[PDB]
């Protein structure tokens, strides 16, 4: 069927007032457990895990920003999103492909629960010198095997804020002084909007 659910297992901020949106806090470069599942009342598929700008701009602008981040990295080989090599994960997915520095593709069977371990390696402030920074999401697009449509058949996202040096846990401790285990991905039905993939190129330098 088309009944998918994804989770991210990390610390989630608390809602101060009605209308406040909820953020999931991550440490930079640290692997978090993500689950993907097809829970229908009744077969292989392909999912793409992305880190994308939440703000939703022109493509030129999103490219501009990835370029700033990539230039500030200490290694040209440093990616925006990574996936771990756990046999736990190996046993549930296959055909892993790093299609871009901010995207990772893989296939899985819907009769299983796919288990991956994912890290995000960019701070929200890495896109400008000296501010609140840029909102980030983890997005997941899921395609059928056939892909006759060529579009996702299902899409969802999770708002995140990324920290350095175990700063994630410190921030929720802070929000407790002033005063659950799992974040579920928010689905959406715009299947046309393709997200920008950052593929660093070194031609013509």
From Swiss-Prot:
Q: Where does this protein chiefly localize?
A: nucleus
Gene Ontology terms for molecular function = chromatin DNA binding; DNA binding; DNA-binding transcription activator activity, RNA polymerase II-specific; DNA-binding transcription factor activity; DNA-binding transcription factor activity, RNA polymerase II-specific; DNA-binding transcription factor binding; identical protein binding; protein homodimerization activity
| Domain of life from the UniProt record | Eukaryota
A Gene Ontology biological process noted in the UniProt record is: regulation of transcription by RNA polymerase II
Additional free-text comment from the UniProt record? GRHL genes (GRHL1, GRHL2 and GRHL3) show a paradoxical lack of redundancy despite their extensive sequence identity in the DNA-binding and protein dimerization domains and the fact that the core consensus DNA binding sites are identical. They have related but remarkably different functions during embryogenesis because of their differential spatiotemporal expression patterns during development.
* Grh/CP2 DB domain span: 1-199
Q: In which tissues is it expressed?
A: Isoform 1 is highly expressed in brain, pancreas, tonsil, placenta and kidney. Isoform 2 is highly expressed in brain and liver. Expressed at very low levels in non-steroidogenic cells.
Per UniProt, the keywords (alphabetical) are: Activator, Developmental protein, DNA-binding, Nucleus, Phosphoprotein, Transcription, Transcription regulation
* Annotated stretches, region: Interaction with DNA: 125-132, 170-173
Q: Which protein are we looking at?
A: Grainyhead-like protein 1 homolog
Summarize which stretch of the complete protein this chain spans: 249 to 480 of 618
Q: How does it assemble?
A: Binds DNA as homodimer. Homodimer, also forms heterodimers with GRHL2 or GRHL3.
Family, per the entry?
A: Belongs to the grh/CP2 family. Grainyhead subfamily.
Instruction: Report the gene name.
Output: GRHL1
Q: What biological function has been recorded for the protein in this entry?
A: Transcription factor involved in epithelial development. Binds directly to the consensus DNA sequence 5'-AACCGGTT-3'. Important regulator of DSG1 in the context of hair anchorage and epidermal differentiation, participates in the maintenance of the skin barrier. There is no genetic interaction with GRHL3, nor functional cooperativity due to diverse target gene selectivity during epithelia development. May play a role in regulating glucose homeostasis and insulin signaling.
Report the subcellular localization: Nucleus
Question: Gene Ontology terms, cellular component aspect?
Answer: chromatin; intracellular membrane-bounded organelle; nucleoplasm; nucleus
